[PDB]
Amino acid sequence: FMVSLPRMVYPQPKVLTPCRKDVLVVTPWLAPIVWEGTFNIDILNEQFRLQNTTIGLTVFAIKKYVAFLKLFLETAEKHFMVGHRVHYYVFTDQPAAVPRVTLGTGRQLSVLEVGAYKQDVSMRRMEMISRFLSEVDYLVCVDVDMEFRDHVGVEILTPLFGTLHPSFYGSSREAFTYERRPQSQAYIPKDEGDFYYMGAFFGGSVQEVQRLTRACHQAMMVDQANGIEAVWHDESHLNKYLLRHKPTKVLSPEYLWDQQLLGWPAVLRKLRFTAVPKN
Numbered sequence: 001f002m003v004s005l006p007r008m009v010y011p012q013p014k015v016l017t018p019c020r021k022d023v024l025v026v027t028p029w030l031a032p033i034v035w036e037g038t039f040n041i042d043i044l045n046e047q048f049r050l051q052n053t054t055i056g057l058t059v060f061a062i063k064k065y066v067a068f069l070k071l072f073l074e075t076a077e078k079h080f081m082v083g084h085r086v087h088y089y090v091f092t093d094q095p096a097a098v099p100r101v102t103l104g105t106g107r108q109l110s111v112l113e114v115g116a117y118k119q120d121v122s123m124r125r126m127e128m129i130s131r132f133l134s135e136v137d138y139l140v141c142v143d144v145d146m147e148f149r150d151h152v153g154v155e156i157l158t159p160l161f162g163t164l165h166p167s168f169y170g171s172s173r174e175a176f177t178y179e180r181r182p183q184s185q186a187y188i189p190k191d192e193g194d195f196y197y198m199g200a201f202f203g204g205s206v207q208e209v210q211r212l213t214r215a216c217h218q219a220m221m222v223d224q225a226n227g228i229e230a231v232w233h234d235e236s237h238l239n240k241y242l243l244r245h246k247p248t249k250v251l252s253p254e255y256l257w258d259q260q261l262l263g264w265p266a267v268l269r270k271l272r273f274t275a276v277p278k279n
């Protein structure tokens, strides 16, 4: 059950005035594409706070990538779901290397120990993700070699979402780096494909994320038994999944950007969550 919103004063939406004219803001299956200027965060904050929404954030920090945790968590504290309940799940082979980061109220961090792989480390995330049902309402699954630079909030939440890959949002579908070998479960032919989604940021309700990760894990297992590894590993399988199960929101590349690589184009009003230079 969902109680009434309170009285709120904000600018009237204008039917004959689009917010953004420069970009597609709804997919052909009527999912919002989330760009700055498309949402009133005050309305959304009210809607999700009234549900006492808890957001789980999963991140893997294996071997040397423990080095990225401090900046990742400190900036998440400043920018990610502020005002909402947050539960960080840090999966690592080095529990003692996890930095002590001060968390705001209503926010918690769990360290989950795993084994380390010698492709595999990136890939096995689907298996490891696939407790959450009892503890959080939504799950967000991100890369750790990243930092938050601006608001990432409840505007992303929905049953199932993907994020536009910053290198491909302007590309035609034959240019997308999908798995092209019919022998792989991740196969997508040249005349198929909506978008190229980034493996570094996806999520949804716990139920939908578990479905997704289960499906990708099963498909990767089939590929392995067939002696094939998809070209972009888990990302290839994510793309196949979101092709056949359309996401209910798509995040713009504001939500996954690399400023060193790609600068700050006109179409991006904010750079929210960005790659941290590495070697």
Ligand SMILES: O=c1ccn([C@@H]2O[C@H](COP(=O)(O)OP(=O)(O)O)[C@@H](O)[C@H]2O)c(=O)[nH]1
Pocket (backbone or CB within 6 Å): 059, 060, 061, 062, 063, 064, 065, 121, 122, 142, 143, 144, 145, 200
């Ligand atoms: O040695 C590794 C390699 C990868 N990862 C995890 O797998 C994610 C994806 O790998 P990488 O980001 O190296 O991705 P890229 O963005 O270069 O494609 C990383 O963010 C980490 O969360 C890790 O923990 N240790």
Ligand SMILES: [Mn+2]
Pocket (backbone or CB within 6 Å): 143, 144, 145, 200
């Ligand atoms: Mn990464």
